[PDB]
A paper describes a structure:
Recognition of N-linked glycan at residue N276 (glycan276) at the periphery of the CD4-binding site (CD4bs) on the HIV-envelope trimer is a formidable challenge for many CD4bs-directed antibodies. The glycan at residue N276 (glycan276), in particular, has been found to restrict antibody access to the CD4bs, an important site of vulnerability targeted by many broadly neutralizing antibodies isolated from chronically HIV-infected patients. Cryo-electron microscopy (cryo-EM) structures of these two antibodies and 179NC75, a previously identified glycan276-dependent CD4bs antibody, in complex with HIV-envelope trimer reveal substantially different modes of glycan276 recognition. Despite these differences, binding of glycan276-dependent antibodies maintains a glycan276 conformation similar to that observed in the absence of glycan276-binding antibodies.
Antibody 179NC75 was isolated from HIV-infected donor EB179, and in a humanized mouse model, HIV-1 YU2 virus escapes 179NC75 neutralization through a N276 mutation. We succeeded in determining a 4.8-Å resolution cryo-EM structure of the 179NC75 Fab in complex with a stabilized Env trimer of clade A strain Q23.17. 179NC75 bound to an epitope that overlapped the CD4bs and interacted with glycan276 at the outer edge of its epitope. The 179NC75 epitope was smaller than those of VRC40.01 and VRC33.01, with most of its binding interactions occurring within the outer domain of the CD4bs. The 179NC75 heavy chain dominated interactions with the trimer, with its CDR H3 contributing ~75% of the paratope-surface area and interacting with loop D, β23-V5-β24, and CD4-binding loop. The light-chain CDR L1 contributed ~20% of the paratope, with CDR L2 and FR L3 having minor interactions. The relative positions of the heavy and light chains were rotated ~90° from those of VRC40.01. Consequently, glycan276 interactions were contributed solely by heavy-chain CDRs H1 and H3. Overall, the 179NC75-Env trimer complex structure presents yet another mode of recognition for glycan276-dependent antibodies.
Residue numbers in the entry:
A (entry chain F), C (entry chain B), D (entry chain J): 521 to 548, 567 to 664
B (entry chain E), E (entry chain I): 32 to 134, 138, 151 to 152, 154 to 185, 185A, 186 to 321, 325 to 355, 357 to 400, ...
F (entry chain A): 151 to 152, 154 to 185, 185A, 186 to 195
The structure:
């Protein structure tokens, strides 16, 4: 399985996932390289951590292909799942979706991972 | 049919970054205290294998000009120079009365008083200097010269054990960042590259000390290559990389030697012991260059129409810039590039002398002079010229004679040389898509 | 959703959770301020990774509102759930409860997130 | 429970787990020790984060005792579960198993934690 | 009967580690400025309690030799010296004309010209030196000496407030790395140790500088202990640690004092003010040592078979190495160890004089001399001797009389003295196993 | 009053010439070197 490969269409691209995920975390007295290594690792650590924090409040850090009943909002794009997995492609797809991403990166943290025990309240308490 | 928000983790999405970058190479010895200016193994030797991979169909817009790496390297390498020189001597016990004499031209023969290993005894001591090491103290008198820095700057000499020899550094990106490589030679650093790849760490990039001519950086294919921020800005830099190399073997033809003199008790200055005395020289034969340039001109005509074109000398500006200039061993050259750029390029059916300098003002900084160690050797360079910092004439002078001079307008551009092929990116693993589901 | 807001009674306070969770991880030559930044980021990261490590051995780093059947020990405060969610409040609640917590921050790591596969032994093996 | 304890047979060794997990993460101007601590904490954080990433792509960061239906390949040591949990011991186990481990440390990231929503496709899409 | 891959997380699996390690101690005052070279609270006081636990049944191979920690600590201590000396004075004006006189032997009485607090006025200023501080400038003349460094190196005087006094340091392993402790005295550093434990941070090592004789190191039990990389390499080090303590109380018998002179305005040099004058000496009464060595020889014969054995003096090499040498308080000793190693050990039915020095070349570095402060005191050492850096003779004298000399063979080995018991390791929490399951 | 007008010898950029150089000082910049004499002050540090 390769790194990158966004020109494979989004489903075929998802034949690979976790090897790109390793790349998020490892590359697979002092001189400047000593302090710059130390700064570098921390920025990567923080970043790796920031996306795990997203995979907390979005859920799915325990199941790295994610599910919610959050609305797909028809203001984003009506493009078909058929187009998306088999003809569309991740960079070109983000270059369509980025105009909405900041909306979703909040709206995704609806109750299913943001609040849902407040609803389990009715399931388990009188 | 209906839909929900869903996420795939770690799918390929990326954007440019101010991200920091760090070194790798082969290990030369694994001694943490090695003789080296770029990487005393305090640069971690992250895998010497370039584990690069195809970006088939991955259309990435490149940008050689808004790239972060130029500024980063410029800062990093200036940091390295200071971190190599701080361990070694500063030369506050050297700006002083110099007495000099003339000998077989402008390698001035000289002596001075200084402190010895003891902070009492004056020692009379002796050295060669190339004339461009010095200026007169106040007036035209034999006793009255000072080193060229002392007017406004302090000098510092690296141990000859801090070689400037250009060992390549590979810039790794930190994880969650990556390098995209334009996987073509038939490309210039702005807009699309249609064929591409990615690597965690750049293939070898030579630190390439260079000042006007790109030394040591690799060649193209299909055509000679031109790169610029904006070619219509005649003032700002134009870069060339050739399809063919030319090799240059410059020499100090003078048998000249380390004279170690103690200047304070832990401090060792390298004065310059002598052997006839001749000007520094560079054997390159004209016609290979001449007909290579005839194709450089033809590549350039694609931007301008059917001009007769001239390459002409750099002139008038500071000699530190206006000569071509580079290291051999640990000792620096400043060559009258005119002899290689005084040349004409019709459309129809169509070797240097040099000055050495023991002092340099590298990166055009205030303060922080380097008195380069005069090398124990008849120094020999054995190296490739492969590209040009051209400047096209600002005088627009159109439709007759449009023309160029070599320049050194930013040493950032002496690195742009190879950097053009690398785009440094963050990966964002945040793959929102429509799908549909219910939680497990 | 606000940050802090602890004077919201504990259930109503849980109308907010994840915006505080973001505040745990992101703010929403060497030199002095650079070494201070580096040290600061590491202390926040290492402290952030401690609570994610707790949400390992406590479970629930996935489901960020947490379940176990670990006993609420009647030696702790007997305050009613009704008081807790709808009149009582977080800083004040921890300032009541901390005297018990060094029990709980270990007794929490019972079988559900410490030993339960030793019980899956009886579910899946003969 | 203790730290270490590898000489307890692997099942009885698993009477301890989570306390060793804490030990993975905390011990339970420049200045020379200061930069060394800063490097040390980063290496520990990143190495701890490297095993959380393993517990991502292997699954089971949400459940620190782990399941997959990935094949136990009979090319590995044939030693019995009874021997392993009740006579064999973790160092002495890994020092028999390391020769296989690199295969497992990739083959473990099969579809269950590497691809499975591509199969939930059949469960939830027409 | 089917099986699947399963994983248990955090199970104890570990391997040798090229990992970094960091300091802890008790807090001496919490003050960041508490006077010390080793651990002035810049070393974080991570838990002073050794919260160790039994590695019951945990069989492990120890490796005193391919251990990281020796090189780590050695690099570390040298860095501590630098980043305790940079805070105080470089003595860059001190190599100068020294005049000297001879007084009741080898404590030379001397005066010199120097800068005052003003970079104009000479001041005549006065100090004692031990002879081994100086060398003649060129000729046998009363005015003509330099400090022993100046020939190749620059000196740095540390504030008396950088006390070299050996406060112990505990190395913590950072988390996900751990320390294994061989939990027996009946052990040598290579192969299995049957009984064992783990520690997050080591029992204080005791970084007394130590040159040939292990000062301050813990005792053994059951037998005397002997350790080496390979005993068939006669030339490379042999370490002894004793089953019985020994104690030494060396003294400067001379009432000698700080004289403080400003050599530049920020720069207090500590000259040495005098009171009859006697050679520095030690008291260790012979017979305790003698019958200890009789058992040391027996433990050595348990390698070699029934030889008569001699311990003989270090000779010919650098006085810095060939004496046993250590600090007391903040001033340094170089003792003619011959009187404690000029002795004979049959099979059948079977006090030092010393030189003080102000300059030291510690760790045998080029450059970076330390001029130790002359301590104000009739200085008293009060310390244990507990082990020996032996060497066995290159005389492979064919089964007759094989013998030993003490030595300063590596200051790494002056730390191996305690590091032998500690093995630093990575925990890998990656417990792949067969069992059965299905996902929840 | 209390703004003294002063001169001293020093090195230049050359480590040889005692350049005579001139500066004002507010009085609290200085102390007498040893005695109440016009040539005899040092900087207060
Ligand atoms: C890029 O520019 C570099 C200089 O800026 C060129 O690198 C080297 O530059 C030095 C100094 O000018 C040259 O001079 C010396 O060369 C010897 C060579 O020793 C090695 O080769 C012999 C056999 O030929 C072998 O017996 C030895 O064991 C070594 O393997 C060195 O000993 C000196 O230290 C010093 O380097 C070099 O000749 C020159 N080339 C190399 C490869 O060292 C470099 O050639 C330029 N590269 C390009 C592509 O243009
Ligand atoms: C290990 O080697 C060390 C030297 O490398 C030995 O450490 C100390 O070395 C110094 C200088 O030689 C000795 O001299 C002075 O001791 C006094 C002690 O004051 C304390 O004790 C008195 C009562 O006796 C009490 O009144 C005081 O209030 C203090 O509580 C210090 O004040 C001086 O600064 C200076 O250190 C030490 O005697 C000596 N030992 C100690 C414990 O300082 C060390 O003895 C060697 N240890 C072993 C086990 O061999
Ligand atoms: C200009 O270069 C000359 C030649 O290197 C320097 O002159 C003198 O060089 C000789 C070494 O060749 C020095 O020592 C003398 O050598 C001869 C043999 O060559 C020997 O017969 C003598 O007994 C003596 O050892 C001599 O010291 C040196 N002269 C000076 C002024 O030091 C000359 O130093 C260079 N010019 C300047 C301004 O330094
Ligand atoms: C090293 O130091 C000595 C002194 O220790 C220097 O000697 C001086 O040399 C000059 C000629 O160069 C002598 O002549 C006088 O020079 C002044 C200033 O240019 C001029 O105004 C006078 O008319 C006269 O010509 C001078 O007397 C002599 N001594 C002193 C105390 O200055 C020597 O030149 C130095 N050599 C080097 C190579 O640095
Ligand atoms: C090779 O280099 C050229 C630039 O040297 C790269 O693309 C070209 O970029 C320039 C400046 O952004 C564009 O020129 C401008 O176009 C507008 C619209 O026609 C015109 O009004 C302006 O006066 C100016 O000329 C140019 O359109 C653009 N495109 C092309 C196809 O040249 C190019 O991406 C690089 N190509 C390769 C294969 O490396
Ligand atoms: C740079 O461009 C200039 C101008 O086009 C070239 O200058 C001319 O070069 C020729 C030789 O190629 C010179 O001729 C020689 O003149 C001497 C003196 O009369 C004579 O003895 C020789 O037999 C020969 O004829 C000519 O003087 C010179 N003219 C000018 C105006 O400079 C030059 O060749 C180009 N290249 C370089 C490296 O300068
Ligand atoms: C300057 O030219 C010389 C040839 O004269 C180049 O080679 C060096 O020549 C010197 C003598 O001038 C050699 O020294 C002698 O070497 C032999 C054997 O090692 C020894 O028996 C003699 O006692 C004496 O030491 C020297 O070895 C030789 N090589 C080098 C590297 O110095 C020299 O390369 C030219 N100078 C420079 C600075 O390159
Ligand atoms: C370290 O390993 C030893 C064994 O090498 C443990 O000692 C004893 O190990 C046996 C393993 O069979 C434990 O089971 C006992 O077996 C005997 C027959 O061998 C049986 O008669 C007993 O009824 C029992 O089934 C035994 O409990 C255990 N005994 C103890 C506690 O010493 C030792 O426990 C292990 N130590 C550690 C890691 O603490
Ligand atoms: C060799 O050691 C002697 C003795 O310490 C140094 O000679 C002189 O020592 C006296 C202190 O006894 C210094 O001060 C004088 O003391 C007497 C009373 O003893 C007093 O009557 C005088 O008014 C004065 O205060 C004296 O300054 C010192 N001499 C020097 C040259 O400083 C001697 O310095 C040592 N030798 C060398 C070469 O330094
Ligand atoms: C401190 O500095 C003063 C000068 O400021 C030194 O005085 C000098 O002392 C020597 C005797 O030791 C005087 O005699 C002459 O010495 C030279 C060189 O050895 C010799 O060739 C002559 O025949 C004669 O003996 C010398 O005149 C005198 N003054 C100067 C300006 O050198 C003093 O020795 C220094 N004292 C210390 C403690 O460093
Ligand atoms: C005490 O120290 C010894 C080494 O001094 C540790 O084990 C021994 O290690 C040596 C070198 O690896 C082995 O010696 C070699 O054995 C072969 C085969 O007999 C022989 O051909 C060679 O000439 C050489 O002697 C030695 O076998 C090995 N075993 C023993 C029992 O010494 C030992 O682990 C340490 N033991 C303790 C209790 O500290
Ligand atoms: C050198 O021997 C002396 C004994 O003579 C050791 O003790 C120190 O003795 C001096 C006088 O020789 C004492 O100074 C006097 O102390 C009294 C009482 O505090 C004070 O009123 C006087 O004005 C005068 O200063 C001194 O206190 C005493 N202790 C020390 C630490 O100096 C001395 O230990 C021996 N020298 C060294 C450096 O150890
Ligand atoms: C810069 O340095 C020069 C010396 O290189 C200074 O010249 C000296 O100035 C003093 C008066 O200040 C002259 O008078 C003599 O002073 C001594 C010492 O107190 C006294 O004993 C005599 O009776 C006499 O009054 C002295 O002749 C003169 N020259 C020398 C060689 O000392 C100059 O004043 C300094 N200037 C500044 C602005 O620092
Ligand atoms: C790159 O994209 C091309 C299209 O750009 C992929 O090319 C083909 O796309 C068709 C779609 O009908 C596929 O059926 C072919 O299978 C694809 N080409 C082949 C032969 O694979 C191309 O594969 C993608 N490049 C990669 C990622 O290899
Ligand atoms: C030029 O050098 C010669 C020696 O080569 C010397 O005699 C003469 O004085 C020098 N003249 C000048 C002005 O430097
Ligand atoms: C440099 O350029 C000028 C014209 O600007 C020309 O006169 C001169 O001959 C050229 N060469 C040199 C070495 O100055
Ligand atoms: C705090 O409680 C009061 C009840 O008097 C309420 O009105 C106020 O809005 C609450 N503030 C919050 C939500 O923190
Ligand atoms: C030795 O020192 C005495 C003073 O103690 C002095 O008189 C004599 O000249 C000195 N002799 C030598 C050769 O140093
Ligand atoms: C040291 O060893 C030599 C023999 O190498 C011997 O002659 C000498 O007496 C010994 N002792 C001293 C104090 O030098």
């Amino acid at each position: 399985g390769f790194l990158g490969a966004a020109g494979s269409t989004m489903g075929a691209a998802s034949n690979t996932l976790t090897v790109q995920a390793r790349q998020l975390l490892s590359g697979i007295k002092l001189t400047v390289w000593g302090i710059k290594q130390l700064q570098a690792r921390v920025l990567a650590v923080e970043r790796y951590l920031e996306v795990q924090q997203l995979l907390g409040i979005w859920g799915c850090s325990g199941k790295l292909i994610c599910c919610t009943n959050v609305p797909w909002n028809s203001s984003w794009s009506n493009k078909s799942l058929d187009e998306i997995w088999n003809n569309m492609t991740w960079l070109q797809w983000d270059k369509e979706i980025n105009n909405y991403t900041q909306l979703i990166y909040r709206l995704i943290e609806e109750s299913q991972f943001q609040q849902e025990i407040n609803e389990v309240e009715l399931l388990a308490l009188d | 049919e209906n839909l929900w928000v869903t996420v795939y983790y770690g799918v390929p999405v990326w954007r440019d970054a101010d991200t920091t970058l760090f070194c790798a190479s082969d290990a030369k010895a694994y001694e943490t205290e090695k003789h080296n200016v770029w990487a005393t193994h305090a640069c971690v030797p992250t895998d010497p294998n370039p584990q690069e991979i195809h970006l088939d169909n991955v259309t990435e817009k490149f940008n050689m000009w808004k790239n972060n790496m130029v500024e980063q390297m410029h800062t990093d390498i200036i940091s390295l120079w200071d971190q190599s020189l701080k361990p070694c001597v500063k030369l506050t016990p050297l700006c002083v009365t110099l007495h000099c004499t003339n000998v077989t031209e402008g390698l001035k023969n000289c002596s001075f008083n200084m402190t010895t290993e003891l902070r009492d005894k004056r020692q009379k001591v002796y050295s060669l200097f190339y004339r461009l090491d010095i200026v007169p103290i106040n007036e035209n008198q034999g006793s009255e010269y000072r080193l060229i820095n002392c007017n406004t700057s302090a000098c510092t000499q690296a141990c000859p054990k801090v070689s400037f020899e250009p060992i390549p550094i590979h810039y790794c990106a930190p994880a969650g960042f990556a390098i995209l490589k334009c996987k073509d030679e038939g490309f210039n650093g702005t807009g699309l590259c249609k064929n591409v790849s990615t690597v965690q760490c750049t293939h070898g990039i030579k630190p390439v000390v260079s000042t006007q001519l790109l030394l040591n950086g690799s060649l193209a294919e299909k055509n000679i290559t031109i790169r610029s921020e904006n070619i219509t800005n005649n003032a700002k830099i134009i870069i060339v990389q050739l399809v063919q190399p030319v090799t240059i073997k410059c020499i100090r033809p003078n048998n000249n030697t380390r004279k170690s003199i103690r200047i304070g008790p832990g401090q060792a200055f390298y004065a310059t012991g002598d052997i006839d005395i001749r000007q520094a020289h560079c054997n390159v034969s004209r016609s290979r260059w001449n007909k290579t340039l005839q194709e450089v001109a033809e590549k350039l005509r694609t931007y301008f129409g059917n001009k007769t074109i001239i390459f002409a000398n750099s002139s008038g500006g500071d000699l530190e810039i206006t000569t071509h200039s580079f290291n051999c061993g640990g000792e620096f050259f400043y060559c009258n590039t005119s002899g290689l750029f005084n040349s004409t390029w019709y459309v129809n059916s169509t070797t240097l002398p040099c000055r050495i300098k023991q002092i340099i003002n590298m990166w055009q900084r205030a303060g922080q002079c380097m008195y380069a160690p005069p090398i124990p050797g008849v120094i020999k360079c054995e190296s490739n010229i492969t590209g040009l910092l051209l400047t096209r004439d600002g005088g627009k002078d159109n439709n007759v004679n449009e023309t160029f001079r070599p320049g050194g307008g930013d040493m950032r551009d002496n690195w742009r040389s190879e950097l053009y092929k690398y785009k440094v990116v963050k990966i964002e693993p945040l793959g929102v898509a429509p799908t549909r589901c219910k939680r497990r």
